[model samples]
Target: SKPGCYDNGKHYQINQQWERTYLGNALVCTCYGGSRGFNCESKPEAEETCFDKYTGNTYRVGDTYERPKDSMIWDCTCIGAGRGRISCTIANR
Candidate 1:
């Protein structure tokens, strides 16, 4: 017996993947081999993004940011292909 997600009158098999974007954020859906009820029609999860601790904003992979800290400024970049953490260094003069 085949199992997967059904949408738009189409059938998707296990281990298949799909994607969508909402409000400028990317959402990804995957059909897992042990999905609950063997249905992949469940809600997809939003793709992970780097979170800026100082600005409360999120950035996609490869995005850079500069923010001030007290008397110094730091240069930061999102790393890990969107599944990693933010790396920061002192901004050079």
Candidate 2:
């Protein structure tokens, strides 16, 4: 296997990338959302819920989302506080 980036006396995988920020380590890589940074010591907190693009509506955690004209609904959940982080799955009717 190939070695990833290194910093702060830590090793990152080849597919992983890390950046030093004023706040702390900004470790971003392939994960649930892939847009937000992940913490090596703890799970990143999601500051927001999901949003429905069809109607510009917001869906909270464990919320069910359905289109105005659709026959099915989706169980939407937020992965992070940003766009493309909303994960939706089919809800059993």
Candidate 3:
């Protein structure tokens, strides 16, 4: 980052942080079947519906979404995946 996130003789802020990789801004893992990302990949229709009901937002395997910068945080992680089903521990609906 040129010791200060500098590039081409230009300066940039250091707060533009995010999960990245050599693959160019690495996003969630490769999704398969009809799933969108690693979080929803292999997720059952029921579980997905349940999550939306509780959080009013889409679910993800390894990510968190807050209630509009307020309220408790919603979090989860994929434990198992396959056959359009996913199991995971959930907290803070």
Top TM-score hit: 1
Q: What clash pairs does model 3 have?
A: 39-61
| Model 1 Cα lDDT, one tens digit per residue, 33-91 | 64553322324334447666656676776567776667877887776454556777898
lDDT of candidate 1 at residue 35, scale 0 to 100: 51
Tens digits of lDDT, candidate 3, 7-69: 224443443322323334333223222322122122123332224444454555444343332
Candidate 1 residue spans exceeding 4 A from truth: 1-48, 80-82
Which candidate has the top score in lDDT?
Answer: 1
Worst 10 residues of 3 by lDDT: 35-44
> Ten-residue segment with the worst summed lDDT in candidate 1?
37-46
Clashes of 3: 1
lDDT of 2: 0.50
The alpha-carbon root-mean-square deviation between model 1 and the true structure, to one decimal in Å, is: 9.3
Ranking by lDDT: 1, 2, 3
TM-score of 2: 0.34
